[PDB]
Symmetry: D2
Subunit: 208 residues, 4 copies
C-alpha cells in the first residue's frame, strides 16, 4: 500500500504554510506495511497541475490526501466536494488571478471526495481533535488540486481514494496578526499533524 500526502508552500504573504511541514514530516514514514510519500506543491496554477500529475503517475498511490491551509478556520475540515471551477480572490505565487474558468473543460461539474470522510471525522473526535465536514474547498489552489486528483482517479483508476483536508493556522502564524488588529483561530502543529496521520490510518483501514 502506498499513500501520497501533499502540502503547499507559503502563499499570500504568509511566511510559512504548516502543510509544507506536514508533508516533509510524513515523507518516508511507514504506517504498518504502508509506505507514505510526502510532497510539497507550488501555489501556482498550471505548475501545481504538472507536479501533481507527475507525482501521481510516478508513485501511483492507492490513497491521496491533499492538505492545505485555511486561514480563519477553527478546526480540521475534511472537504466533501471538489468543484470544476477556478475563481481566485487573490493571484497565485506567480501573480496570476484566474477568474470564471473550468479546471478541466467538459469534465464533471464536481466530484465527491472518496476518502471515508465520516469515519475520519469520527476518529478525529475520539482523539479529541475538533473537526467537521466542509462543503466548499474554495475555488483557488486547494480545490484545484482536489479536483484534479479526483479526476485522475475517475479517469485512470487510481488513486482508489482521494480527498482534501484543510487545517487552521498554527499558533506561531498568529503572532504578527495581532498587531494588524485581529486574532484568527489556531491549532497546534502537533494536532494538525496527528489529524492527517489519523486520516491516513482510517483510509488504510477503510481501503479493502
Amino acid at each position: 500500500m502506498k499513500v501520497l500526502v501533499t502540502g503547499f508552500e507559503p502563499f499570500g504573504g504568509e511566511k510559512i504554510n504548516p502543510t509544507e511541514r506536514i508533508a516533509k514530516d510524513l515523507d518516508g514514514i511507514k504506517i504498518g506495511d504502508a509506505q507514505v510519500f510526502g510532497r510539497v506543491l507550488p501555489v501556482v496554477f498550471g505548475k501545481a497541475k504538472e507536479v501533481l500529475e507527475k507525482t501521481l503517475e510516478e508513485i501511483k498511490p492507492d490513497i491521496a490526501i491533499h492538505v492545505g491551509l485555511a486561514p480563519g478556520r477553527s478546526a480540521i475540515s475534511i472537504e466533501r466536494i471538489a468543484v470544476n471551477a477556478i475563481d481566485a480572490r487573490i493571484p497565485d505565487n506567480e501573480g496570476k488571478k484566474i477568474e470564471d474558468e473550468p479546471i478541466v473543460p467538459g469534465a464533471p461539474t464536481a466530484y465527491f471526495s472518496t476518502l471515508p470522510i465520516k469515519k475520519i471525522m469520527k476518529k478525529l473526535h475520539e482523539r479529541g481533535i475538533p473537526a467537521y465536514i466542509s462543503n466548499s474547498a474554495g475555488l483557488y489552489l486547494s480545490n484545484y488540486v482536489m479536483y484534479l486528483s479526483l479526476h485522475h482517479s475517475a479517469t485512470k483508476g487510481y488513486p482508489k481514494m482521494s480527498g482534501f483536508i484543510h487545517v487552521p493556522y498554527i499558533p506561531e502564524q498568529i503572532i504578527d496578526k495581532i498587531g494588524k488588529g485581529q486574532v484568527p483561530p489556531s491549532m497546534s502543529y502537533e494536532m494538525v499533524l496527528e489529524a492527517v496521520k489519523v486520516a491516513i490510518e482510517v483510509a488504510l483501514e477503510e481501503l479493502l
Copy 2:
C-alpha cells in the same frame, strides 16, 4: 515570594473548565524560590468572594493571577481593567442572575490590573503563544473576582500585583459543540498552562 493562581469550576453546562486543571497543576510547584499556590473558586457570587478573601488573607500572596475560561476567544487574553459592576447574562451555579449592581458600594468604578500586562504579552509572543490585551473581562464571575482582588490590594497593601487572564476553550471541549452546528476557537491545554506559567515568571521578574 508567594504566588496565588486561581481557576474556576465548570459552569454554564460545560463539563469541564480548563482553568480548574490549571490551578491544580500549578498548586505546590516552585518557580525558583517562589512558592505557587493553586486554588479553585466556585462560579457563584458571594461564595466566590468568601473563598477569595479567605485565601488572600491565609496566603497573603505577593502576586495574584486569576484565570478563567472565555468561550469563543481565540487566544490568551490579559485583562486590563476590572469594573465595579455585576450584570450577568446567565445565572451562576446557584441559579442567581444578578443585574445592575455594584461589587463594592462606594468603591472606585474601576481598577487597572497591576500585573505587567504589556511585558507578559510580549514574552508570550516570543514563546509563540497568541495573546492580546482585553479591555473588558465581562461583568460576570471573572470580573467579579478580578475586581475584588484589585480592591483587596488597594485596601490592604497586598497582593502587590493582581490581574486576570482568560483562556480559550481547549480542543476536547469543542467536540460536542460541532453537533450543535458551530465550531468555536480552541487552544491546547499545554499552551494555556504554559501561558499562565509565563505570566507568573514575568510578574516575579517585574516585582522588585
Copy 3:
C-alpha cells in the same frame, strides 16, 4: 416572459422567514412585459419537491429564482453551485433529519447556477447593496430546491435560468436573539426585497 420566485415558510423555531414575505410581495407584479409569480415553499423534504415540481410544470417559467434565509450571513449571497446531497444539521418542519443521501440518485454530483451571478452581484453593488458569491448553499432545504430546480432545467429544457439567493436576517428577527447572548448580522427587508428584484431584472436582460 415569466419569472418564478420562491421563498420558504418559517423554520428552526424562527417566528418569520423574510423570504416568505418576498415571494408574496413579488407575486403578481410585472417588470416590463414580464410576469412574476411568487410562491412559498414548505421547509419539508419531499413536500417541497412536490410543490416545486408542480409549480414549475404549471407555470413553466423562463427564469426561476429561489430565495432563502441564511442565519448569520451579513450580506446578500448568490449561490454558485447546487450539490446532489442531503445532510441536515437539523430536522425539517416535519421532524425529519435526513443524512448522507443523494437528492436524485444517478444525477450529476452538482449543477452550476445558470443565473448571471457575476452580473447580478455587480448591479447589486452599483445599487449600494452588499453581496457576494457563495460556493455552498448548505445541504438542507435551500440546496435541495436549488438542485431540483437546476435538474429540472437540464432534464426538461426549462427554466432557461435557475439559481438561488440567500438573504440575511432582517432587523426585527434579531430582537429576541440579543437576550440569548448574541447579535447576528441583519439587513433591512426593503434592501433584501430590492436585491431580489434586481436579480430578476438582470436575469431578464441577460436572457436572450
Copy 4:
C-alpha cells in the same frame, strides 16, 4: 433643554463616517421644546479635545450623546463605561499613535455613562432596532471623547447626562470591502439615525 450630539469625520482610510451625517442631520432640529445641536469632531487626539471642550462650554448642554462608527459591530451599541487610557491600534488622522497614556492624569480610572442605557436599549428593541450594551468603547478616539465628556460633567456639573453610542457600518460602506475578501455587518443609515433620535428622546424623558 439643550442636547448636544457629536459625530466623527472619516478615518482609517474609510471614505465616509455615517456619524458625521448623523450630526449634520440632527443639528438644529427640535424635539418637543428641546433644542438639538449637532457637531462633527476630528479623529485627532488633542484637537478633538479642544473642539469638545469649547463646544461643551459654548452650548452647556443638559445631555451629551457622542456617536461613533464601530467597524464590524452588527447592531447599535450603547457604551457602559469610559476608561482613562489611550492605547491606539492605529494612528489618528494626524499620524499620531499614542500608546499607554492616561487621558486625564490623576482622574478616575473610569466613569460610567450617565445616559439611561437600559431604558434606551429597551426602547430601541421596541422600535425593532437591534442594540446591546457594550462594556468597552475601545481606547482610541471614541473612548477619548466619551471619557472627557463624562469628566467634564463630574468636574463642571454639566452635562447632566453624557454617554456614547457606536453604530455599525452602513451598507454603502461595505461595497468595496467585498472585493478585499470579507463582508462585515451593516445597518441602514435610516435605522442608525433613528436609533440616535430615540436615545435623545429617552434621555430627555429620563432627565428630570
